[PDB]
Symmetry: D3
Subunit: 175 residues, 6 copies
């Protein structure tokens, strides 16, 4: 049913993100099982860190690494895992890990759900604190994870973000 | 799967309500997408208000306004969004908005889930504080919402509530 | 979709548990409806007690009592109702109620989600406090429930636990 | 400073209760240290039970058992440990333990803080569910506690409650 | 001890606010008792509203209305009632009620506790959403309160805010 | 009042720790002000990390760095900031920062509050996960803090821990 959900209304400008992990939650990392569509516990994280933003993916996309693009979505309040939020891509956090290339997009709630992020149009528009903190989380989160590692490659603009969306959508399609 | 869920066991006396928003939660308003059945964020509310009761709808119903009846269900404890609770209708809060007529029913957990609300048989049986507070929420919640408004038209009995249930069920059916 | 979920990867050693009720939650007892697969409120508990562990079941199993085996899964952090966790059976709490025989298994997160419970291989490996507390909960939880009762019959090893899993799986299958 | 706090405005009708443990909290039992006035952890409870109401005491009182009277105060919402609430006594739960006689009073927020409990004038006015549940908690809470036990002796009216308040106040005074 | 706390390091530019009510909490309104210094429940609010910011006061100040100035302090995270936060005044919300004149200041965490609010220097620097929402809360919060009312008189700058601080400090002093 | 609190019952074996920051809380770092004894916000942390254990200090102690020893206390449940817990020292985490030498002790609830940590007698008795995670937190927590840094120097036994307690007590005394 969650596997039924669109990529967006008007890709890559207007997309839907399926939330897997809420902002500020306990460090349980969940994932939607592509087969059933149910939320599965992937791992209990060992580090005393929490996701700075709601974390999820854009359905009907296949990124370079085998998986749908992953998106981080700031909100006034934490969202329920498994809920879909309409968003608008604004930047990318480039990082390579041991999968190879695992960019995380940054998307802000679309303006129809709230006007609070209307001024956030590109990656420099986002608070520096927050960017520092996302980078920082991704750099350290798998610290205590034996066979897992991340090189935080840097930040990219909304155009690069939107290129990734299209490219991944296409990658999954036929057309 | 949630779109599979019945209206009730024995409509309008015994109904099932699909919970969209929990009592006392952060002001995120979710909704079940009729197409996929997943929970979607509709809007981040701007007012510093919270739903006094769990909020949801009765599936397989079509109210006047295009949507299933909406129900408010008091409980000892907040329920998870997307869960179904068996209830018994006891009153209605009449209000017209810019959709036209948007009555909210008030339903209490059926007696098989708890005996705590057995004495609540009709609308006057409900605490005055609570009624004041629901009315009050509905009157003000979209205050900061540009193109949205509500005239809280008053309270109605369980018979009026049950008439709405039947009428909406029928409206959606064929028969 | 949740009714689609497997029993396990490699039954009875490696199973999946579908979580209905989180550890430490408010005393709302939910259940997955076999027909729709949605989470339904079963009862508001009257006692001022909370489940010591996440509570759930193993799909595609039919226990003696008509239902799938029920499993209690300790975790660092409470899990979301409706999520699946991979586990490894380690003991059983035997108890008969007014259904007849309602053993609850005890399963620990598999080692791929966390190494924290690697040392927990059998029932004596589990903290005494916790065992006392599960027994204790099951003994008293339906105290204020008119037509419901439990005789906590005692604890059993992982072999007995795994026998139950197989036996219930088989019971549900054909083969 | 908390040891400075009065017994009440107009004892025994109008009293102040110093809250030690909130309603519904994790099972940590705190206590105010008479010497410093700070909140001290007394014990981590082993049972999977939670206090049904905010729990505290009336300062400047000496009960039979060596301690100030203990009061249970229902509220719409859980209170912070160490805060004082103005209340009005309405009933008593008689029970003897291994201290000897440890009645717990039941007090409702005074009407100046809320009108919600104005109808609660005597012990029969209180919900049956709640009374069952307090009795029930007190009966079982120290179950797993080696050298601790309770015989829940039954419920008493507001007059008996108010007699205890006066008697304990006097017991502590001179006059 | 809380009655011992200074007004600020360097009044009115650098002040300390004693937090009475946290941001986003349940609608319990607490207050520090000037006599003991303990936190007292003042009222259970009847409206389904929550304070948008942490709410408190500046000690050693006497406002026009008989009380210390009241301050609203935004923070990344809710603060504990009774804790002191160092802040910097940036604006005022003028409103008259039935006390007569009850301005609420708006203060941001000082830069030594966080750099997140360094850009917030004056009242226009604060998000519009937030200002709308504070105004909005103050306008409606005592709606269901019989003998209580508020006319939200409008917003003022940091200079007006700082004038109030000095003036109130002086009012309480001698010198 | 909190400045009145003893170091312990029977130093260094049996000590009291005054809790400043709870386990798993939002990343607000509080501190008790030696002058008033009230809890003060020190800093909003910028990293998306949370204290793995309740964090506090032993009153009437002066460590090398100018401050009382700091203690980390695991508990079943998070404690309230400002509450005192009786503990028993079991290990030390040596680390030097830009203060110079800032060892953090590790103390477990005394056995009179719970038997759950009776087996924890020395530093190797503590879970490896937890030790990894404390080390890990201390190593990274001030990452985004300009003028602050930590070299996690390693772990030490209970004897070294108890030597620190005595030495710091003495340092503060006269005798």
């Amino acid at each position: 049913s969650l596997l039924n959900v669109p990529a967006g209304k008007d890709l890559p400008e207007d997309i839907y993100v399926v939330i897997e992990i809420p902002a500020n939650a306990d460090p349980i990392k969940y994932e939607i099982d592509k087969e059933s569509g149910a939320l599965f516990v992937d791992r209990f994280m060992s580090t005393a860190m929490f996701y700075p933003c709601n974390y999820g993916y854009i359905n009907h996309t296949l990124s370079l690494d085998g998986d749908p693009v992953d998106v981080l979505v700031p909100t006034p309040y934490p969202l329920q895992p498994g809920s879909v939020t309409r968003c608008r891509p604004v930047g990318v956090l480039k990082m390579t890990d041991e999968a190879g290339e695992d960019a995380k997009l940054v998307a802000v709630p679309h303006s129809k759900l709230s006007k609070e992020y209307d001024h956030i149009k590109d990656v420099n528009d986002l608070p520096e604190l927050l960017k520092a903190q996302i980078a920082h989380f991704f750099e350290h989160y798998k610290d205590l994870e034996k066979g897992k590692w991340v090189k935080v490659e840097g930040w990219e603009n909304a155009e690069a973000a939107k290129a990734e969306i299209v490219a991944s959508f296409e990658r999954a399609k036929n057309k």
